[PDB]
Amino acid sequence: YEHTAVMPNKVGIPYKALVERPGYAPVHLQIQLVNTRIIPSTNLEYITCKYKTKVPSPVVKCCGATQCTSKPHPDYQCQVFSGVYPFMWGGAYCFCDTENTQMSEAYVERSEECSIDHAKAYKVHTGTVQAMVNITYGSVSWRSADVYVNGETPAKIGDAKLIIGPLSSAWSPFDNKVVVYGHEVYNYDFPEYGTGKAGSFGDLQSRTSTSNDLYANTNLKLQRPQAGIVHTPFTQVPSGFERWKKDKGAPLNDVAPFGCSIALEPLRAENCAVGSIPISIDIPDAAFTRISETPTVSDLECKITECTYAFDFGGIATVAYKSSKAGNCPIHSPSGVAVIKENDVTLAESGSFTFHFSTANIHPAFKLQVCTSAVTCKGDCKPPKDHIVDYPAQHTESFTSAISATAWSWIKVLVGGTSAFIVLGLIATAVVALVLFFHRH
């Protein structure tokens, strides 16, 4: 048998339903989610890290000139200094006074730390959504396996067959371009591998962590070695990646709405709460017993003992019944006024049973069906003492969940009396018109 419905996109809140095969006893059904992961499709563009500029040994011609060509290196620099006359240990290095030449070339490359901490640049696209469901039905225990949230694919669990419907919202916390540095994820824009302004984010752009070609502009410039000392000095702007790690705001796993915890190894967005998920479950035909082998109850009267507003199961009710035989049959409230803590009861011959429920109304007007027989329950509820709890609400608050009986009496008085005060006015002009018409003849 196939049962279709719509479940909401909440994780810890179970969905309860009562399937009704004709000619057979009803079977309780319980679907619960564990995970909900949105997995966008990403492709790496470039990584970035702190640079490390190496300087080769300069050549010191004693008297002459040595020019350099152009080398295929990122941010390569050449500048020839004339007339240096350097000193080393053990006397002066050169002889030809006031006519000398120093090479002093410099070159920018990736640091050794770039294999460990590096920000990875991605663009995302819409990909797969998958979840993890928990299923029980009848007398079968809990079974769980991860499904795919597309209408087309079925995933069997136990002996059933579940088709989780598509999500009704295409919302995703990720932007078009993201930066994944270390543990956290940032919503950011890139200089698109061509540009980089030497001090913000893209002063070193490498397409792969082991790539050979490298882009780097760090405003490298060489300076004159002074006072006859053999060294190659240079001034350049500091690293933009080192600056970005100071001046970055909050990561996406602290800003994302709906409580989406962001994971990393497939770059997921776990456990969001938006929209609703349709369902369809193929219950096996061997789980349905014949209706004649079940108790048939009658003369049900339900009185709600104590009720309250609270997020947990704060309502207690008792049902007095009378049954033909002793057995088990599930209970379920089809309305949204209350949810039921219990799933089934053990019956006898003309006894009683009690159950726990949670609601948001002052006056609950729900009904529940036990042993394919229904009974209505009414009552009153009280405000709870607790101000803040640490668990989500089991129920769903509606638009008219706050209006009491006394507040609706003032709604009807303020509407009924003032509308009828115009009806008295409108019937007054239709009477004196009739009186003046009868004065005409």
Binding site: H387, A393, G425, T429
Partner: protein, 105 residues
């Protein structure tokens, strides 16, 4: 930090995150006098019950000045076919019941 019924989470230092939700306690009492009813709904809704309070007195003011533009017009048609000719005997139903101005002469 203001916590609504949707929830709020906070991380302090290197501690794991903690989530808290707000219940619907309130301060007032809905089953009582009209000053007690409004106070309870003002704390629960501080954004909707100040509009519906102004709307309900806007409709009442409109419906009151609509009716007295029609009750006084009707009473102005009681007097104009009787006060013109004072010799006509005014019936006893129109003196007090149907319209307010009583008999004389």
């Amino acid at each position: 930090f203001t916590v609504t019924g949707e929830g709020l989470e906070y991380t302090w230092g290197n501690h794991p995150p903690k989530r808290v939700w707000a219940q619907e306690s309130g301060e007032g009492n809905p089953h009582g006098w009209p000053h007690e009813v409004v106070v309870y709904y003002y704390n629960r809704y501080p954004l909707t019950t100040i509009i519906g309070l102004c709307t309900c007195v806007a409709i009442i003011m409109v419906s009151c000045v609509t009716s007295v533009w029609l009750l006084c017009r009707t009473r102005n048609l009681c007097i104009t076919p009787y006060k013109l000719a004072p010799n006509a005997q005014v019936p006893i139903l129109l003196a007090l019941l149907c319209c307010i101005k009583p008999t004389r002469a």
